Amino acid sequence: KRKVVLAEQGSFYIGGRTVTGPGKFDPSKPVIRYSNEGATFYINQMYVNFQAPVRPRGLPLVFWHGGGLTGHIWESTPDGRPGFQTLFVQDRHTVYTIDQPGRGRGNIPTFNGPFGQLEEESIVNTVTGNSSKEGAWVRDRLGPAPGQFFENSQFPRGYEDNYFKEMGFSPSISSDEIVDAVVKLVTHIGPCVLVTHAASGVLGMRVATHAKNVRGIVAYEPATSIFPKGKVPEIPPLADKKSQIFPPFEIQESYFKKLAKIPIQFVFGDNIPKNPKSAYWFLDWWRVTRYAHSLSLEAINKLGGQASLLDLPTAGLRGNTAFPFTDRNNVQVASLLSDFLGKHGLDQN
Amino acid sequence: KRKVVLAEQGSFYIGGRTVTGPGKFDPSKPVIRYSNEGATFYINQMYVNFQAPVRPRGLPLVFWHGGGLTGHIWESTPDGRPGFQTLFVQDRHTVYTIDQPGRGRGNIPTFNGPFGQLEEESIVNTVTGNSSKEGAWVRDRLGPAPGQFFENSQFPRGYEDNYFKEMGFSPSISSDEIVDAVVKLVTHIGPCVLVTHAASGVLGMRVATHAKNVRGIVAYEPATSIFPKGKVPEIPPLADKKSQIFPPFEIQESYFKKLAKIPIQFVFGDNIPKNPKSAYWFLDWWRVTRYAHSLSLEAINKLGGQASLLDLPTAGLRGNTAFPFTDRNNVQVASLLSDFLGKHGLDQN
Ligand SMILES: CCOC(=O)c1ccccc1S(=O)(=O)NC(=O)Nc1nc(Cl)cc(OC)n1
Ligand SMILES: CCOC(=O)c1ccccc1S(=O)(=O)NC(=O)Nc1nc(Cl)cc(OC)n1
């Protein structure tokens, strides 16, 4: 249903730091002008929204959007059906949704001058990068080429404009500062579960190594693998003989071992090939990336962990894209998330 | 009272257009690359959130943040008290909150290359501008100089960092394209009331002249005045005898006359000086800007309109900043908005 009853809701800012321009502020001179004189700027802060049900049961959930996205992807699907925010408030969890630093209602650090530049210091790069509709189409596995859909597709076809409009650029904020803001949120909230997506996968793993309050991770289609420092296994190049997946993130073993203390599930949708696919770069990228993640989870398990890989087709769900939580069967995807939380008692007080 | 019962909630993207890079897309090639080759980019779209109560009464309200802000300002106050979104859902109105193009979850049009540049075309300027903590302090009339409060201030003291963290830059998207997005939303919604703030004041007036569905406007501390073309009255410079207020927006009389067909209220807080204040630029700016608005409302009334100026101190509310709807007495401010809606029948079906 669409009905939701909230004991309370709201939003707040957390994290970040300040930087300044030179000189002193004079309230008698024109305030609106091209200058950083006497100016203090808040940068790299994060936006957080929360919705709490009446009588919550179990741990709060923190939904962390993927690369170039915002908390919108947890609010509604492109065709207007309820997102995981509504579904999990109905499932009696308090739900936090974030816009990480650099995205959406999070801070974009720019000043008076060329983008990202505060006098002679470059806070973020002036040159940006960004995905396109065509690139996102194949990245998210709607189909093998733009305009084409896989046979089984759970994408909300007809709502392509709504979907692609939710995506945008990210300034070059360091990943350390993004992780820092979420660590501060986790400290503020208490024991919780991180639910991550694509680019935020590796970031949530890092947060968990810095914050014991992270009691579980569910990562949809994580984009970068993580390994103990020096211990990255052999990972093959892509079928084009030339490209590689994202360089795996390496952390000190004492931090990596903290991942063995909590339940971790990685979730993949459909249409990731089992064999090399030289004609379709992003399908082959997903094949090797998923392979790397299987090795990462094995390394966590070998250290005593509780890490698992869930392929949605093996659970009877066919046709999911890389955004299973906004696909047409997102209610069944949510059911599998509820199952994970129930298995580990994360839905009990 | 923090509880809210929602018949439905969600979010969506509306408006915008597309721009394209050179050439064609090949799915065999590396997709993550420094290139706009074959790229279609969605630009200048707007984010929209809605919450609908059970059995709504009257017209939906569209809350439109001021300059450099987002829909956060209607969700919560900096100290975590309920914003107008919650208060007006409780008051039985469906509530829309937007992040306009270029702000928050709205689109920031940038690509692969220097900020805002698509190959040789400048979609928005690479050089940005932004407010500082110090400039915003005096702009919002927390006090006469940064760090100092008016004795009577309604600002939630102690939550300064939270407040200033909600503010940011806006890329140089044309005002025409911002107005266009909101006109499209109003067409989608049907009859509605615009609630604007500061920079969005003039934009909401423009929307109403294009969209008969706007049935009322309440503008908090509007920043730019509006007049019929060629009929701008004499407006003095500031007390420094150098500076001017924002050049008034001029529109054809045929469009201006549409403003006389709906109830319009401009709402101002406290601590705007009656007399020239050369020592405090932004206090003097507000004095002359409020004067210009008084003449704008007079012009609407001479065309048969019903346009009023509400100074909160005359209603018994003292110390309000330029964000009365997040101040400590925001419940009393909300009551005055409910009074306006009820008097004009905008709270009945
Ligand atoms: C659902 C959001 O997708 C992701 O998080 C994601 C997934 C796989 C690989 C990279 C990313 S990413 O965002 O961290 N990075 C990109 O998607 N970058 C990127 N994507 C495309 Cl399609 C083109 C491009 O060109 C610069 N750059
Ligand atoms: C409450 C949000 O405030 C407004 O909407 C507002 C109000 C009055 C004047 C200008 C703006 S504005 O945003 O459209 N513009 C600015 O506030 N710009 C701005 N403010 C400051 Cl204090 C400094 C500055 O330097 C470029 N530039």
Residue numbers in the entry:
A (entry chain B), B (entry chain A): 12 to 360
Excerpt from the paper describing this PDB structure:
SulE catalyzes the de-esterification of a variety of sulfonylurea herbicides, such as MM, BM, SM, TM, TrM, EM, and CE, to the corresponding herbicidal-inactive parent acid. The structures show that SulE is a dimer with a lid loop in a domain-swapped β-hairpin covering the active site from the opposing monomer.
To understand the molecular basis for the altered activity by Pro44 mutation, the crystal structures of apo-P44R, the double mutant P44R/S209A in complex with CA, and the triple mutant P44R/S209A/H333A in complex with MM, CE, and TM were determined in the range of 1.32–1.78 Å. A clear electron density was observed for full MM and CE molecule in the active site of P44R/S209A/H333A, indicating that MM and CE was tightly bound in P44R/S209A/H333A. Superimposition of S209A/H333A-CE and P44R/S209A/H333A-CE complex structures also revealed a similar conformational alteration of CE. In this position, more favorable interactions of the heterocycle moiety of MM and CE with P44R were observed. The heterocycle ring was packed against by Ile43 and Ser142 from both sides. The sulfonylurea bridge also forms hydrogen bonds with several surrounding water molecules. These interactions make the heterocycle more tightly binding to the protein.
